[PDB]
Amino acid sequence: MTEYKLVVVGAGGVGKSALTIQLIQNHFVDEYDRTIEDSYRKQVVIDGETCLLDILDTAGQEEYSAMRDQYMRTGEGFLCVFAINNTKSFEDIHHYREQIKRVKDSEDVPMVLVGNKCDLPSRTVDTKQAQDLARSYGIPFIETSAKTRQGVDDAFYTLVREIRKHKE
Numbered sequence: 264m265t266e267y268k269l270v271v272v273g274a275g276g277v278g279k280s281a282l283t284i285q286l287i288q289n290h291f292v293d294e295y296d297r298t299i300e301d302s303y304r305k306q307v308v309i310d311g312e313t314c315l316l317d318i319l320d321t322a323g324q325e326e327y328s329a330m331r332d333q334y335m336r337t338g339e340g341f342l343c344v345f346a347i348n349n350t351k352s353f354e355d356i357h358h359y360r361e362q363i364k365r366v367k368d369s370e371d372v373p374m375v376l377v378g379n380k381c382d383l384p385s386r387t388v389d390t391k392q393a394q395d396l397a398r399s400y401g402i403p404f405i406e407t408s409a410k411t412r413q414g415v416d417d418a419f420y421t422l423v424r425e426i427r428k429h430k431e
């Protein structure tokens with residue numbers, strides 16, 4: 264039974280924690296408190312093969328880098344998350360992708376681009392613009408909402424498929 268170490272990266276506030284909790288625990292966190300755990304695990308079936316998802320939820324604050332850059336070497340696939348109502352977080356995708364390629368020392372790292380908060384009306388990042396950037400990187404692009412769970416399973420499952428394709 265194969266285990267996949269998935270790393271969720273992105274700027275502060277894009278919903279890295281909310282996506283991980285919605286996937287693992289099936290509820291949306293917002294106003295109320297929550298217990299910190301960082302490491303989340305789940306058994307899933309993807310394309311008829313049962314596997315274990317080991318998800319690392321990193322912090323967006325760049326002053327805390329001993330938690331994110333340390334585990335960039337251990338991660339097998341990366342969820343690069345921006346929020347569709349946060350132009351700066353979309354711009355920052357380039358910075359996270361370069362940091363990953365530097366640590367992994369590879370041009371073909373399993374990655375999925377994720378535009379979160381697609382339930383909100385205040386969009387400032389066009390879908391076609393993010394599709395164009397993902398095409399430039401050669402990676403899938405998935406729009407998600409941790410609030411409604413739209414696209415959440417697809418984003419993490421697509422990353423696993425990228426990892427499986429890379430391991431051939």
Ligand SMILES: Nc1nc2c(ncn2[C@@H]2O[C@H](COP(=O)(O)OP(=O)(O)NP(=O)(O)O)[C@@H](O)[C@H]2O)c(=O)[nH]1
Binds near residue numbers: 275324383
């Ligand atoms: N409307 C909406 N709000 C969302 C969505 N995902 C997250 N949020 C909200 O956005 C805020 C930040 O979410 P959070 O998961 O803490 O973001 P983060 O990327 O883990 N932040 P950090 O980098 O500081 O750890 C919260 O108020 C959360 O409820 C979404 O899909 N839709």
Ligand SMILES: [Mg+2]
Binds near residue numbers: 279280281320321322
């Ligand atoms: Mg968080």
